[PDB]
């Protein structure tokens, strides 16, 4: 016989990896007497607060900087990405002054906690950055919409980027004796702006503050010491982080006979979907849920720094005519505040040793992905709608995860 | 020599210091995209 062999393009596959070395500080913020409505918005709610600094596993800058991702193709996914954690010490005060309440001594009693799934999976919020006290300032005071990317009221504060990277060459702002300094780059310690908390408001709605205590677990610091209290990972269920890979529309009848409508009945399911629970209620609640569903192709990020911008997109990009679901976990490292001596009358607790927790944190991830052309002459990578991929939009955030779950995330912005 | 003037050190054990440091300079226009990563080409121990 003889058969003549058929061609074949096998385009292959980027796959990259990515490490960083940061070096973060926590506070002992004191358990933090909740702070009423952030917002002159919610004005009648408040937030139990915890000293659960935030690690932003899902931001991509904790893994990669501008420029590596700057470069990834299209259709780049972000295949596993993780995080393990050393208590790698904590320092408390030592009162000199005498003053106050606080008896000075050379003691020193305090004690890591973590925990990981609580943010998302739980009930509560990451709320914050905030705004706080004098000695015995280790409980703060004003709440804040967590900050990731860079905060501004015209001078600005922050940027997890820049903070990790510096400047550009010519970048003023930084770059200076005294300006944005590329940290990570040169082992600096750096803060993990953001703790945990919880919300709760008054009436509607009712009962008392939930268990924290029992979704966290602590030590005694010093025994788990320079010891790793982190490492879980998360693989993504859809973590696209590059503008997608583009279906060339070239077959042939109606499917470019025209640029018109060929639909099908094809008694499957196909679209994505959404909750929408009716919570009303007169003295404890009373819910309904209504499922809609909706459609899908239009882009997935603009304005390049959108770096910065969420990793797993498991609610709203559907690959391909179908469907799925779920959220990141979330992860918090930390020491509960050391308590001032406060002697003989104390029968409040309310004084608290100013301490600073020093977690050894790495990050790494994977993200790969291929650049195939199956046309002769197309310009751009390009595959089909076998897969092509499509998005779900929206008025507001899809998904806000600056605001406590239901599992998903709710689609609206909190405090 | 002198109750106070240049010691002889090393012959009879004292300190000194290492006087130079090092950077890594870098300017502004004439090439540019960034500070490398200096911390993948040193180590790092808990010094205790």
Same mark, same amino acid.
Not at 95 to 119: D, H, M, P, R, Y
Not at 328 to 339: E, F, M, R
């Given at each position: 016989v003889y058969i003549i062999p058929r061609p074949f393009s096998n385009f292959g596959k980027k796959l990259s990896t990515y490490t960083k070395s940061h070096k973060f500080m926590i506070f002992g913020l004191a358990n933090n007497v909740i702070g009423p409505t952030g917002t002159g918005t919610t004005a009648v709610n408040r937030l139990l607060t915890t000293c659960l600094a935030e690690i932003p596993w899902q931001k991509l800058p904790l893994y990669m900087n501008q420029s590596e991702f700057d470069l990834l193709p299209p259709?780049?996914? *972000? *295949?596993e990405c993780n995080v393990k954690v050393i208590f790698r010490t904590n320092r408390i005060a030592f009162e000199t002054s005498s003053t106050v309440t606080k008896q000075a001594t050379l003691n020193q009693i305090s004690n890591v906690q973590t925990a990981i799934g609580l943010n998302k999976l739980g009930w509560g919020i990451n709320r914050a950055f905030t705004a706080f006290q004098s000695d015995q300032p280790m409980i703060p005071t004003a709440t804040t919409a967590p900050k990731y990317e860079p905060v501004t009221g015209d001078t600005g504060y922050r940027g997890m980027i820049a903070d990790y990277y510096g400047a550009d060459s010519t970048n003023d702002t930084a770059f200076g004796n005294a300006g944005n300094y590329p940290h990570h780059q040169v082992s600096s310690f750096t803060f993990l702006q953001n703790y945990y908390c919880m919300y709760q408001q008054t009436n509607q709605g009712t009962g008392g503050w939930p268990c924290l205590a029992e979704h966290l677990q602590q030590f005694d610091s010093k025994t *788990? /010491? /320079?010891?790793?209290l982190i490492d879980v990972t998360y693989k993504p269920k859809m973590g696209l982080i590059k503008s997608p890979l583009n279906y060339k529309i070239i077959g042939q009848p109606t499917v470019k006979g025209t640029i018109s409508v060929g639909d099908n009945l094809v008694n499957m399911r196909g679209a994505v979907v959404t909750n929408p629970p009716e919570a009303t209620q007169n003295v404890a609640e009373s819910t309904h849920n209504l499922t809609r569903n909706f459609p899908a192709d239009l882009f997935n990020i603009y304005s390049d720094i959108e770096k910065s911008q969420v990793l797993h997109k498991g609610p709203w990009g559907h690959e391909n005519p179908q469907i799925q679901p779920s959220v990141h976990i979330g992860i918090q490292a930390v020491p509960a505040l050391t308590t001032g001596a406060l002697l003989i009358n104390s029968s409040p607790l309310n004084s608290w040793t100013d301490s600073m927790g020093y977690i050894d944190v790495m990050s790494s991830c994977t993200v790969m992905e291929a650049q195939p052309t199956h046309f002769p002459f197309s310009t751009e990578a390009n595959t089909n709608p076998g897969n092509t991929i499509y998005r779900i939009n929206l008025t507001p955030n899809s998904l806000t995860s600056a605001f406590n779950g239901l599992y998903g995330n709710g689609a609206t912005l909190g405090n």
């Amino acid at each position: 016989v003889y058969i003549i062999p058929r061609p074949f393009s096998n385009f292959g596959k980027k796959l990259s990896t990515y490490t960083k070395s940061h070096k973060f500080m926590i506070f002992g913020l004191a358990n933090n007497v909740i702070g009423p409505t952030g917002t002159g918005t919610t004005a009648v709610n408040r937030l139990l607060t915890t000293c659960l600094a935030e690690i932003p596993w899902q931001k991509l800058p904790l893994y990669m900087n501008q420029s590596e991702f700057d470069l990834l193709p299209p259709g780049s996914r *972000v *295949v596993e990405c993780n995080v393990k954690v050393i208590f790698r010490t904590n320092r408390i005060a030592f009162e000199t002054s005498s003053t106050v309440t606080k008896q000075a001594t050379l003691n020193q009693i305090s004690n890591v906690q973590t925990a990981i799934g609580l943010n998302k999976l739980g009930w509560g919020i990451n709320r914050a950055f905030t705004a706080f006290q004098s000695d015995q300032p280790m409980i703060p005071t004003a709440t804040t919409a967590p900050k990731y990317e860079p905060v501004t009221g015209d001078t600005g504060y922050r940027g997890m980027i820049a903070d990790y990277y510096g400047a550009d060459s010519t970048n003023d702002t930084a770059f200076g004796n005294a300006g944005n300094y590329p940290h990570h780059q040169v082992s600096s310690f750096t803060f993990l702006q953001n703790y945990y908390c919880m919300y709760q408001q008054t009436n509607q709605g009712t009962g008392g503050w939930p268990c924290l205590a029992e979704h966290l677990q602590q030590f005694d610091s010093k025994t *788990v /010491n /320079n010891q790793c209290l982190i490492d879980v990972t998360y693989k993504p269920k859809m973590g696209l982080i590059k503008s997608p890979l583009n279906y060339k529309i070239i077959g042939q009848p109606t499917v470019k006979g025209t640029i018109s409508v060929g639909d099908n009945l094809v008694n499957m399911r196909g679209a994505v979907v959404t909750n929408p629970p009716e919570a009303t209620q007169n003295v404890a609640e009373s819910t309904h849920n209504l499922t809609r569903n909706f459609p899908a192709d239009l882009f997935n990020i603009y304005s390049d720094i959108e770096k910065s911008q969420v990793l797993h997109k498991g609610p709203w990009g559907h690959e391909n005519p179908q469907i799925q679901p779920s959220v990141h976990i979330g992860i918090q490292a930390v020491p509960a505040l050391t308590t001032g001596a406060l002697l003989i009358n104390s029968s409040p607790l309310n004084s608290w040793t100013d301490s600073m927790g020093y977690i050894d944190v790495m990050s790494s991830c994977t993200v790969m992905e291929a650049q195939p052309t199956h046309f002769p002459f197309s310009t751009e990578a390009n595959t089909n709608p076998g897969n092509t991929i499509y998005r779900i939009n929206l008025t507001p955030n899809s998904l806000t995860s600056a605001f406590n779950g239901l599992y998903g995330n709710g689609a609206t912005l909190g405090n």
